[PDB]
Amino acid sequence: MIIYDTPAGPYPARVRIALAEKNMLSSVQFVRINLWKGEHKKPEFLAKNYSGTVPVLELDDGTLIAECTAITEYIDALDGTPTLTGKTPLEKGVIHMMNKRAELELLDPVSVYFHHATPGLGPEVELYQNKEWGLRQRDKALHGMHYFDTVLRERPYVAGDSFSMADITVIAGLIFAAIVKLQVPEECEALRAWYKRMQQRPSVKKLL
Amino acid sequence: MIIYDTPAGPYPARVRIALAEKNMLSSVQFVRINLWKGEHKKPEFLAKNYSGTVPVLELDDGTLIAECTAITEYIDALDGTPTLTGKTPLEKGVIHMMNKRAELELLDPVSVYFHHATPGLGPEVELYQNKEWGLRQRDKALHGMHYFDTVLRERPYVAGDSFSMADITVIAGLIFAAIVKLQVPEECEALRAWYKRMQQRPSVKKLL
């Protein structure tokens, strides 16, 4: 397999974590895409991924798989024992719900805040910025942090009693928030402790 | 199973078509959520779905599954023969990629445009509106139509050889387009051809 990404990107992390977690990290050669130089927004790369984002997976036959969820879906099913994605119908439903919610209410808003209300990748890559929109998404990420705090009050993992794709997404969201210095509120003690523990999980530890 | 939704909603259409496609539509009871009245934004429904959107599926054990993708993922896995969601690892990856991209580049943008650059659900519900952002999202959806047009020139269905959840998402994007009178470009003939077919699928035809 080939992956196109940037090694310290919060979204690329989700896949890198999943790969370690499946013991498949060895299977992959990574190719660098420089986002600061806008390489992802160039015709060559849009040919690989219309959305212009990283990571992207390229199979041995040349099939391209973009989107973290989709790539994780693929690599988790590859070995016949879904570990991150759900075994039963209900596990599949709950993990996908909390994964999507993790994107919606935490990770995406942090990323939109970064690109629109901060300089982001810089005045040369960010052609249109909507400051007020990026701020609305910051506010949404803050509420999202509170939300995951109440979830992780009740449970050790976001989607039940096992580590899943959904935990990987929350981790990446807090990786991104740390990068742009959007502080997890003090009152979210469960989220903060859980995060510091997650940073020591072998799959996450190796990454950082 | 219980579904909380609004019958004519484009996102609720995604689960209704999937339910028909699995022949589970008679196993579900539908509860009306009035979006015009802002019922999805009140604390009563927010306890059900922190994200404040429809549809939400309720199982017999009181489990609530939010998000069209997660709901579909649950019901597709239920009879043990995944039709909409993918059998092989390769099929899950691609279907999930295209399903998500359908959300990103078409469906979600039309919906954001509706809420932000038109009057949407009205002022009692649209308390915050960013017109410039909604307008940019409308252009994003127009580009998305062109993108899915290029795809459908080369494939019978969005995710490849067979009908999937990814087709359902574009259907719903096209339904939303019509609500807001965002015309599909006449030049997008592969997309228009595919949609014409979609309108005569029993599951889709039922819903329309």
Ligand SMILES: N[C@@H](CCC(=O)N[C@@H](CS(=O)(=O)O)C(=O)NCC(=O)O)C(=O)O
């Ligand atoms: N489940 C969807 C989101 C659903 C959604 O946006 N639904 C609409 C309903 S509809 O417009 O399609 O009928 C909604 O609740 N929107 C109300 C709002 O955004 O205020 C998802 O996959 O994230």
Ligand SMILES: N[C@H](CCC(=O)N[C@@H](CS(=O)(=O)O)C(=O)NCC(=O)O)C(=O)O
């Ligand atoms: N898997 C994609 C990743 C999306 C994404 O935004 N990736 C980032 C990479 S990183 O910021 O996390 O390192 C990107 O390419 N952003 C580039 C841009 O928005 O210009 C998804 O889930 O939508």
